[PDB]
Amino acid sequence: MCLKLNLLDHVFANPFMNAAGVLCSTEEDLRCMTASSSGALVSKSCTSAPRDGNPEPRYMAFPLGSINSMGLPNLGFDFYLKYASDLHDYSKKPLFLSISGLSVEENVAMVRRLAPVAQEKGVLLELNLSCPNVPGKPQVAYDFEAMRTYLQQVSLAYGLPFGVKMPPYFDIAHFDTAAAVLNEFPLVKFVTCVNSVGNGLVIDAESESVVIKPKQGFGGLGGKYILPTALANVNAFYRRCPDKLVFGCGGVYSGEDAFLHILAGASMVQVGTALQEEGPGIFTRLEDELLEIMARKGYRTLEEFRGRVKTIE
Amino acid sequence: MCLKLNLLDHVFANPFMNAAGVLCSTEEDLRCMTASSSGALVSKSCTSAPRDGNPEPRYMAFPLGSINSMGLPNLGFDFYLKYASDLHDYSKKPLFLSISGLSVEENVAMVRRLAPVAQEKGVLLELNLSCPNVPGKPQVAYDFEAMRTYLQQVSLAYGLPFGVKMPPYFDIAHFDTAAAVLNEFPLVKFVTCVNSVGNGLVIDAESESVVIKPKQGFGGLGGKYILPTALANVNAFYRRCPDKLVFGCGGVYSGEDAFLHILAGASMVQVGTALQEEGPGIFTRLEDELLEIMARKGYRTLEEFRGRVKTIE
């Protein structure tokens, strides 16, 4: 029985990795994720220049999940590029680098510099088209013309296989249109579904207050709140992008939740809120728990059940 | 201390009502909702002609909420209009009638016949712009040009105060645009936030199967999954539509959940999934619970705290 995968010309011990943004902003965080049992890791979404992000409190967690408006705090592209070029031990596991420029121009400037490092070292680009937490900057992937422009310009400037981090959609016509946009771009080899469910609002009854300071308390939701939304978008894109990989993200706390993602079509399975709350020991637990489910069902590999969710009638 | 309030030139005993679609399809249902301790009721969204709806199983509930793809099954507008005109006891509580035509023309046809009964009896119109479950008919209010056309045509045909059932939005630009569209129409006097979070997907691990039959398992989500999204929308619209009422719907299971909706800005509070699961006895419990929270905090009235959610700095 086996959790190994081979995709995008890399080998993975298992499908689990962090979700972008969680346990991946500093050199310390990246070494920690590397030292963990995860199959891979992804760096914090970066901008050309360092950012402090939004004021605190900007993340909070609860039984059912998390709310965040971090504001894209990061050490800047130069640092994550250096990590990829000089510091990361690729003998341990594959590295993804998340880029989240605030304009098409900033993304193109970054990917131009990334390309030689991707060629040399095999770092993989995840292009973030879904941040929901920087004031005055709606999600790029909710404007399909903007999305197309970003992908055209990035494809042209980068010229190498990459993937995209997508927001959740909630309308079949939006699935149809977004997947069709993506399918215009052959270099988009993977689609990560989903970013946080945007602009929710958690309120504390005792204090009568919102629980995060930025944006009058509005922030992206993760965790148990979003699992069926996540599974829906995984499956929607799995069905609509038969020539691409889909990576699942949203609501993973157990091997069973990972199993659902995989049934829905996920290749890699990313872990955000639960990893933030539990720490990197979660990866051994998720591995054991997925293996257990597979043993009980007689499944020997992930491809025996990936995308094999049954519909009724 | 009593929870009674006045809104829309009607008196209500308390702010509680069913969510449209739940316990409101048949004469029996509507008599039961009338007999309950809810402050008001709303009928099942109706079409000009009767509809059987989508195939079964089409609703399923779980500890964290529900998924449904009912497909607008209803007895037909003639039945709901006759209920409003001839059967409902207005001495017990106000009645809202929900219309959900599948085209602008269908909605106009219904509201032209509703108008005289609204003038005579005081039944209130809730225009449903957010059904996520009829194949090929995406949510009207996710197309702002379409939403504008519907609201121009209904306002012209109806000529009387009405309200609108909105989908959840997840992007600040969408809140800004949607509220500005609503604010173009002075006859829109209430905004109900939210309909189900569209097109989620629940999968059962043991069977490896989706749990509802229509649309390959995709359906709208209600219940605990959606409370922070519902609160966000209620507050977003409460902030942006200062001359309209906001009715809250989504994730209400307790008096505390109702207290948060009201803090976010809700005037009425609708109960879907929890009502479907618990039955109409839920209304006495919610009232007892909300009163108890009010007492412990020293609130005498709902107005003292409606919309008075605190932000940080």
Ligand SMILES: Cc1cc2nc3c(=O)[nH]c(=O)nc-3n(C[C@H](O)[C@H](O)[C@H](O)COP(=O)(O)O)c2cc1C
């Ligand atoms: C603290 C925090 C930071 C995040 N930062 C990023 C990020 O930099 N880039 C990104 O694509 N998504 C980011 N996300 C979104 C997560 O990658 C993930 O898509 C989302 O939390 C849903 O997964 P979950 O339910 O496991 O939390 C962040 C989430 C959290 C909670």
Ligand SMILES: Cc1cc2nc3c(=O)[nH]c(=O)nc-3n(C[C@H](O)[C@H](O)[C@H](O)COP(=O)(O)O)c2cc1C
């Ligand atoms: C079985 C079912 C039927 C529904 N039918 C309607 C409907 O006819 N019209 C409508 O506007 N909303 C309908 N909804 C949405 C609910 O009114 C409500 O907006 C949603 O369920 C979220 O509230 P909740 O979290 O309390 O369930 C329906 C929901 C369910 C569960």
Ligand SMILES: O=C(O)c1[nH]c(=O)[nH]c(=O)c1Cl
């Ligand atoms: O605020 C963040 O930093 C953040 N938070 C999110 O939930 N998703 C994102 O893509 C980002 Cl970039």
Ligand SMILES: O=C(O)c1[nH]c(=O)[nH]c(=O)c1Cl
């Ligand atoms: O499928 C339904 O009938 C239904 N279900 C919902 O969750 N919202 C609606 O507006 C409708 Cl009309």
